[PDB]
């Protein structure tokens, strides 16, 4: 049994007014004892969000760089994230890979550094539509997962998030069975490439479309251990998703 | 007369404690009249710094993206920057261009968006060593400045910062005469391609190595209107540089 994990990625949305209201709503929510909840605010608001959020909810940064301090204008380090009271960082998000061209190697180095500095890591992988239709879903997600694994010595504070990028605004959508299919393959890769123990214990969360209407069936899939939620994470709907297994 | 402008780019350095100390020292400093001082904290600390800094000192973000909200995990918008009480953003910094591969096109789009949203912009340009040695300093900085300028509709909100990347961490050093040479070329470019008014009124600040021992000679150069200070901005030496015209 792996502990249910629900992360909310606020992306680049919100201001203090709107996010304060959202945080009020989340603070009022009775968070299930068996569910681990994490919110990832825009970078300018990590501090603000951590101050306002009840400690029952953890805060994540949406990205970080790979050294503790340096001449990297516009970046932040795991040390700063921890200093702001956040305990997680999202790494390798599809938007960072594809819009900002972050390489597997760079993401791997970020993972190693974030873990070494005491953060938990939500490490994201996922294939694009062209890749899925060319039939290389496995080649792609396995290679992304491998580079992440090459940089994980301890999987205790790692959560893998599968993003079906092929279903983001493409005209295709993933069924719960298709999500389950990839999650199972990913877990199989962990078994065959790392260990049975790591495969059994590592949360693989779903980063596809999830809403109040769909969260229950997705959460029931045997290899789906939770969610990295997009737009719904900014709405009272997020609470329904937190309640997915209740 | 152009108002002397001193910016401190903290880059990816510091934590609440050390930055709190830096801020205390800055608050206690006597800033000369007619000197505009701006500090650019790491993104996680924009909010923190603005809360702690005397209102006499403005806060800048070190980067932003080109739309107001959106699916850009890890980015922030001019709207968020303003919401945290900051009034400037640094754009096109050498580290953004050369470590994170930000294109001129992207930088131009960011400048346009930040200005449309009512932020001030510190727009950075500068040539690398291989460019300097190839004798194409003017070609490079002129092309960078052109993209910036094509995306400016009100120069009263812009400061241009020349970074001699060729001298920074290469082992080469820039003299006051070399800085002045480039600044005069840039002002002449503004005069020829934008207007006489804009050339006369626009601050062009020097973003190369500056110490307490070099700042007065640099600030005495006719076309040098201040500094974008790097590492020294974290130290008491910054106050000396603020007083370069004194």
UniProtKB/Swiss-Prot annotation, chains A, B:
Catalytic activity: D-glyceraldehyde 3-phosphate = dihydroxyacetone phosphate; dihydroxyacetone phosphate = methylglyoxal + phosphate
Alphabetical UniProt keywords: Acetylation, Cytoplasm, Disease variant, Gluconeogenesis, Glycolysis, Hereditary hemolytic anemia, Isomerase, Isopeptide bond, Lyase, Methylation, Nitration, Phosphoprotein, Ubl conjugation
One GO cellular component term noted in the UniProt record for this chain: cytosol
Active-site positions on this chain: 93 (electrophile), 163 (proton acceptor)
Pathway given in the UniProt record: Carbohydrate degradation; glycolysis; D-glyceraldehyde 3-phosphate from glycerone phosphate: step 1/1; Carbohydrate biosynthesis; gluconeogenesis
Modified residues (N6-acetyllysine): 11, 153, 191, 235
Enzyme nomenclature, EC number: 5.3.1.1, 4.2.3.3
Gene3D superfamilies noted in UniProt: Aldolase class I
MF terms in GO: methylglyoxal synthase activity; protein homodimerization activity; triose-phosphate isomerase activity; ubiquitin protein ligase binding
Example of a GO biological process term: canonical glycolysis
Cross-referenced InterPro entries: Aldolase_TIM, TIM_sf, TrioseP_Isoase_bac/euk, Triosephosphate_isomerase, Triosephosphate_isomerase_AS
Modified residues (Phosphothreonine): 170, 211
Nucleotide-binding recorded as keyword: no
CDD domains, per database record: TIM
Stated family: Belongs to the triosephosphate isomerase family.
Disease: Triosephosphate isomerase deficiency: An autosomal recessive multisystem disorder characterized by congenital hemolytic anemia, progressive neuromuscular dysfunction, susceptibility to bacterial infection, and cardiomyopathy.
Subunit (UniProt): Homodimer.
Entry protein name: Triosephosphate isomerase
